Amino acid sequence: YQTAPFDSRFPNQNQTRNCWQNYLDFHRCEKAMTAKGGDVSVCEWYRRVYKSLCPISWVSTWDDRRAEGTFPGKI
Amino acid sequence: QTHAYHMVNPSPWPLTGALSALLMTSGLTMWFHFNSMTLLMIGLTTNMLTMYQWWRDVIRESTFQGHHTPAVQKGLRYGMILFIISEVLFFTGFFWAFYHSSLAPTPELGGCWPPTGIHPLNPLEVPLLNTSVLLASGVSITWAHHSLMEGDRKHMLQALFITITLGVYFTLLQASEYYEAPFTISDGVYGSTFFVATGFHGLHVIIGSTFLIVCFFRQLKFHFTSNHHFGFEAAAWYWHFVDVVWLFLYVSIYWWGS
Amino acid sequence: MFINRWLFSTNHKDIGTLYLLFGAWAGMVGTALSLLIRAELGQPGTLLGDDQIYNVVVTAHAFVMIFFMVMPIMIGGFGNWLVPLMIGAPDMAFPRMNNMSFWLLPPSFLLLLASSMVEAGAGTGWTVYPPLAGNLAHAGASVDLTIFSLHLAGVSSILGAINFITTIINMKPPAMSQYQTPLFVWSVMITAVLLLLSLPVLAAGITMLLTDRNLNTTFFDPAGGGDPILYQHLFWFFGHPEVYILILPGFGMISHIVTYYSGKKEPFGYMGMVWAMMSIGFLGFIVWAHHMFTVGMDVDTRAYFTSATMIIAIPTGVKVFSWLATLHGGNIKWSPAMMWALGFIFLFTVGGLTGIVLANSSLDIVLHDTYYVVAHFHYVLSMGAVFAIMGGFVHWFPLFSGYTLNDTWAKIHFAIMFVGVNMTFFPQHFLGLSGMPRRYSDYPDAYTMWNTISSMGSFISLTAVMLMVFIIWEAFASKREVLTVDLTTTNLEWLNGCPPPYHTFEEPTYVNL
Amino acid sequence: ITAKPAKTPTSPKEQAIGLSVTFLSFLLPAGWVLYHLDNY
Amino acid sequence: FENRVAEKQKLFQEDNGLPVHLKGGATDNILYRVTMTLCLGGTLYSLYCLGWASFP
Amino acid sequence: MAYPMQLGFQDATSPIMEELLHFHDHTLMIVFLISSLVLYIISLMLTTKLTHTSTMDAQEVETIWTILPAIILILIALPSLRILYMMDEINNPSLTVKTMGHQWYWSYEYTDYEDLSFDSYMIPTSELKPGELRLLEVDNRVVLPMEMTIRMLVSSEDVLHSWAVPSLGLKTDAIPGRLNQTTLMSSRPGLYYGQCSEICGSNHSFMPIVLELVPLKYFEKWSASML
Amino acid sequence: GARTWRFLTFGLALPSVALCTLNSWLHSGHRERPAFIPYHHLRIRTKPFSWGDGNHTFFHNPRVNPLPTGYE
Amino acid sequence: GGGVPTDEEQATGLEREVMLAARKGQDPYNILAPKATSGTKEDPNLVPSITNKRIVGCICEEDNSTVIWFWLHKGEAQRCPSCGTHYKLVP
Amino acid sequence: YEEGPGKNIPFSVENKWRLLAMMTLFFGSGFAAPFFIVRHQLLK
């Protein structure tokens, strides 16, 4: 892993949804693996991609909203 | 003159209207920023005085003085159509804002439409009733038009009264809707698009209803002939415009956007 | 009698005179703002010591020149004076509504000068983009007063558009088809259609900005799901038609001036000139996103906007070549108005061609938000509009006033102005190519030489403006009353004398089929 | 264009006065503000 | 109601030199003065407000 | 960076800026030629005592006046659009860097592996080291590997800004709530300068961009030292 | 003619309004309000409103419109 | 049911004058385009006027975009300076 | 209303020197205004 590869779902200059989708994907997968006592290494691809693409302040705001119960995406 | 056009007497109403615009805008500024409604209420008063006296004079010039030859009437027809076109393009801007927001919902909304936490109105309840009301009022205003062309005073007044009653019913239903809505103008872009688009539409319904009421009183005073009644035609065109904007709002915001 | 005539007017000529006076006054304001801009940039470092005030000066400069100088002069002034005369009509369709289009402009201007005097002004650019124009980065009344100034100007021009379209469609002689109306009348009709369709979209967008600033809407605020780029689309959907609004009446005046001073009865290729203006008007609605090539839109969208934008060169070239073919074989009269019109054709062509450079999205990445854009529009808009206005002013001044100008003084004025504008704007191309951003109060040291020259140019144009006022004074001071003009057989606006009586065409023209 | 002789001809001297007053009306107020920018 | 348009046509066509905004009689004069006083006074008040708002 | 008395573009540092230089040369030749032809024909129309003032037939000449411009526009559009599609063309970046605009400075995030981030402020004129450039120097430069495809993601934490580096052919608006992507590839080491290119208030003139392009080994040493 | 348009008014248009009125009146009961969640994209306050305490929307309904801090 | 006034009953001022003149096939307010004669010296176009001169616009050939404007004076017929068509003023 | 040269304007051209005063005040006020607004903002 060097950086997030080209993703044909997000081929344009606006990459907002690429960051968002990988953040959701990581947290949905982390919930599925924890809720069984499973293994979060399965979620690693999504973690590396969102960490690469997403502004630190977006990740930090989303994290705070998940802990507050105000995150508006479905996890 | 040996042309058929109207040389208008020098008039103060353009200047009083221009100053009413200054007072309403400086008044909104002084309400939003300086905690005061004074200028705004003066501007609203001078705006209503200006519109009353200007359109009174147009009635004096036409019904009482005979200045509306066929050539003048043709100009007024073009003027009202061009005015309605400018109002269509105004609404187009709000529809553009609605489709921009709803077709590409941002992550702050939950990346979905309607946004997370928004409970839209059921479009089959009061919004469907509002649709039947304005469509019915388009039928009754057409009955009024035909009664007037056929020389039938009683049925013109009955049809126009029914049209106005339906306009008022829409306005009271929308007022009630506004109060019962569990979302507000501050509920993000969903509230913003809903209240600004339907709010400008409700303003046009009140304007349209007011125009129909002017036509009702002019008809009671025998101003219209079976052949010459442009104020009635203009109010009917404006009323159909208000109906058609509603149908677009209903399909776009209430139904497709729910 | 004075208040009845000048405050309660229902006369197209008097209202045209009010618009010309208003526009000339606004031009002094806009010129003063332009000289403050070039004084700040005239040497490296800070002059005003306040970059918020610099940004307010730049913003006001543009609003004054567009909304209070060009549109009032071209449409309110020449339009109201000439359109009824050129179609033999006794006035405008809505002579009282016409007076309200005029009287909305002083209040509009007052709201703009209030924006600049309260808080720290609206230092937004004339585009007023959020979030800079929002209630956090521009807290206070300044931006709201700018929005209201635009509302009043917007209502003035929408009602004026309704009046011109109705007048031109409904008030010609019954034998005169639309294909027997003069090109200036076509240019006003088409401008009025663009105003009618574009200003309501601007009104929707700045109303959304008002509600985001004051009613807790979020049309342009990502926190509520809004999008700053939506404002840009609404603004430029108006803004591109607006630049064609600013030049089209100038195209009409240039057609009349070139025809007149070539000693011709008619412009070359009349139906081609009508086609070209209608084509430019139509295409002007489908190109707006060339103002947005750096905001992150899709490559195919950039390809479309590049291609559509370049198409406008075709009808535009037909007009340029048609003006040249009107000169062809003329008995040329080297009047000052002809000099303005020839200056127009050349300077408009240069600016139009830098437009075609900018149309290329790829190159636009490097030229966007640089002085190359500033150079482009000061050629095509600033010099185009101004040269067309000065040509129209010196041509029709004797019609409006009954008095002649001193032609030698008017030629001196032209010569000074031609030197000044070229010395001011030509070097801005170099500044843009070499990467100097627009909307800057100061610049890296490398950009000093061309900024210095540009600022020296701005003072030469000031000398021309001061001379222009003197020349107008000398004409009213000397009172050389017009007797005759040539070519009245193809210039109906002259046929009632100079100035024409308060009421003209009480008895309409006789035109048979 | 043809015109009657000037009803009230403006001599070279009258033009120098007109030009001078015009230029001063532009230059003096702006000059006063720009000269005092330090004091501001 | 009764059709009294002919009586209003006679009033508004009387050869008395009045402009149409005043031809109805003394009530027109009163409404005009109220309108123009509120407009001019309101405009003077808006300038005062500008003077106030122009300083901290 | 620009130099005194410069007329044209900064020397190209990237292959796409090279393509833009060659495309501008082609287009400028056409601008010159058309400008010159219009001025020439004006002088030609104005320099003869010969006259023809009767009605002229326009139909034949208007074919020439529409077809020749249409051909010229196609000859500009073909290479313009080839370059447009080249700067969109899928590439595999080896590095992603974020930049966030602020009133009035840039921050940079290198979060491919480490959480590295820092702010980048204009050096005031009173603090410039001898020989440093007024309005262009920053305290913390954007360290990047040369000869490698880099993905830059641009956004804002407040108002609009625009992240520009003329010598690389780059300009991408910085919009809050939006992540705009561009590709960066430097053919050379060195320092490459740019300036905020969307009006963002009083200090718009004073929040520059400085890239520092170094061989990959030195980029990796710099990254490692940052832990 | 007028006779036809009156026929449509009374025979189709007003009967439609009567049926939609019945539909509306039958579904008019108060819905149970949802749990309050202080979502950051809702109850926006960038400037106080220019009426009341600055925190109430113009047609605020206590039963169904929570404030930023929740139901009154 | 009646009760709506007709134009015949209630039109007034210039509207009524236009209405009454159209019933008689007259056009005192210049609503209609006049039909040209052959325009020869024997058959000139007859230009009504309430005064001793009136502006004539001559569309010399159908579909000409250029209209030729001139004052036509009381007295001997005048000719369009572009096509030579004759016009005679009839006060 | 009065008709003819110098009579179709809201300002008098009866006296060229009074005209020069009025034109000077008219265009001079417009040109001065931005200098005095800048001064006003700087003195804040």
Ligand code: HEA
């Ligand atoms: C009078 C006003 C006016 C006119 C008429 C135009 C005309 C054109 N403009 Fe310009 N423009 C502005 C005023 C105007 N513009 C303003 C004010 C801005 C900046 C707004 C802001 O950001 O503040 C601007 C900005 C602007 C941009 C955005 C640049 C950026 O911000 O990065 C672009 C992009 O495509 C554009 C292109 C054009 C084109 C292609 C034309 C065409 O219509 C030109 C067509 C004319 C010709 C081409 C010349 C004549 C033709 C011939 C002689 C025939 C032969 C020619 C060829 C074969 C090429 N202009």
Ligand code: HEA
């Ligand atoms: C019609 C529009 C127009 C006109 C005429 C002008 C005229 C001038 N402009 Fe510009 N300008 C703009 C429109 C115009 N401008 C716009 C839209 C912007 C962008 C704002 C933004 O970024 O948001 C701009 C920005 C702009 C900038 C860039 C600021 C920056 O990016 O920081 C500069 C820099 O030099 C400039 C300079 C000038 C100068 C020196 C003049 C003049 O001094 C040139 C000489 C012309 C005159 C002196 C006019 C004379 C006319 C009259 C006085 C009327 C007479 C009336 C009658 C005869 C009836 N203007």
Ligand SMILES: CCCCC/C=C/C/C=C/C/C=C/C/C=C\CCCC(=O)O[C@H](COC(=O)CCCCCCCCCCCCCCCCC)COP(=O)(O)OCCN
């Ligand atoms: C019943 C049917 C219709 C009712 C009409 C509305 C009544 C009051 C206002 C009148 C003006 C309406 C026009 C549209 C403007 C803005 C918003 C109006 C829509 C409305 O009334 O929305 C209300 C908010 O009003 C608000 O903020 C307060 C709004 C009051 C101040 C508005 C000021 C804005 C004026 C803008 C002027 C621009 C004009 C454009 C000119 C263009 C020219 C080119 C919604 O209530 P809420 O509590 O949030 O949610 C309901 C919760 N139970």
Ligand SMILES: CCCCCC/C=C/CCCCCCCCCC(=O)O[C@H](COC(=O)CCCCCCCCCCCCCCC)COP(=O)(O)OC[C@@H](O)CO
């Ligand atoms: C409670 C109120 C609060 C809200 C306030 C806002 C304003 C509300 C106003 C409603 C509009 C009332 C208009 C009344 C016009 C009456 C004059 C009229 O109707 O005039 C007629 C001409 O029409 C004409 O000018 C046609 C004139 C058409 C006017 C068009 C009106 C639409 C105006 C909209 C206002 C702006 C909306 C924009 C909002 C952003 C006269 O000709 P006839 O009818 O042929 O008569 C002659 C015959 O009798 C002869 O036999």
Ligand SMILES: CCCCCC/C=C\CCCCCCCCCC(=O)O[C@H](COC(=O)CCCCCCCCCCCCCCC)COP(=O)(O)OC[C@@H](O)CO
């Ligand atoms: C933020 C707050 C800012 C808002 C400020 C609003 C601005 C100004 C205050 C408005 C004051 C209006 C007073 C009444 C104006 C009535 C105009 C009218 O009705 O004009 C008529 C013509 O326009 C016609 O018909 C058809 C056109 C009728 C137009 C009615 C006026 C509407 C004004 C607002 C419209 C904006 C449009 C919305 C789209 C963006 C009549 O023309 P006249 O020349 O009078 O007479 C001709 C004679 O032959 C008649 O016998």
Ligand SMILES: CCCCCCCCCCO[C@@H]1O[C@H](CO)[C@@H](O[C@H]2O[C@H](CO)[C@@H](O)[C@H](O)[C@H]2O)[C@H](O)[C@H]1O
């Ligand atoms: C001949 C013409 C007659 C002119 C008379 C003008 C009419 C009103 C004059 C008094 O001015 C008012 O005074 C109130 C204070 O004394 C203000 O309260 C305002 O401030 C309150 C704050 O307590 C808020 O509730 C409201 O914005 C508002 O009432 C109110 O806004 C403002 O209009």
Ligand SMILES: CCCCCCCCCCO[C@@H]1O[C@H](CO)[C@@H](O[C@H]2O[C@H](CO)[C@@H](O)[C@H](O)[C@H]2O)[C@H](O)[C@H]1O
């Ligand atoms: C962008 C357009 C600007 C173009 C520049 C105009 C050209 C200069 C015009 C003259 O302006 C004046 O200059 C004087 C200086 O020459 C100033 O006197 C100032 O300086 C004098 C001498 O130093 C003192 O005696 C005075 O008291 C003092 O006010 C005076 O105020 C100012 O009106």
Ligand SMILES: CCCCCCCCCCO[C@@H]1O[C@H](CO)[C@@H](O[C@H]2O[C@H](CO)[C@@H](O)[C@H](O)[C@H]2O)[C@H](O)[C@H]1O
């Ligand atoms: C006939 C032509 C028109 C004539 C115009 C007449 C103008 C009337 C002047 C009234 O002045 C008012 O004074 C109030 C008290 O001084 C202000 O109250 C407001 O400001 C107060 C400051 O004490 C606050 O308590 C509140 O926001 C509010 O009461 C209010 O803004 C202002 O309008």
Ligand SMILES: C[C@H](CCC(=O)O)[C@H]1CC[C@H]2[C@@H]3[C@H](O)C[C@@H]4C[C@H](O)CC[C@]4(C)[C@H]3C[C@H](O)[C@]12C
């Ligand atoms: C009695 C009177 C006659 C009208 C006349 O010829 O002057 C009639 C004719 C039409 C009547 C109106 C229409 O029937 C419609 C309405 C019917 C409602 O029941 C009363 C109000 C209402 C608005 C009526 C008022 C009044 O009774 C009117 C105006």
Ligand code: CUA
């Ligand atoms: Cu940041 Cu301009």
Ligand SMILES: [Xe]
């Ligand atoms: Xe507007």
Ligand SMILES: [Zn+2]
């Ligand atoms: Zn003829």
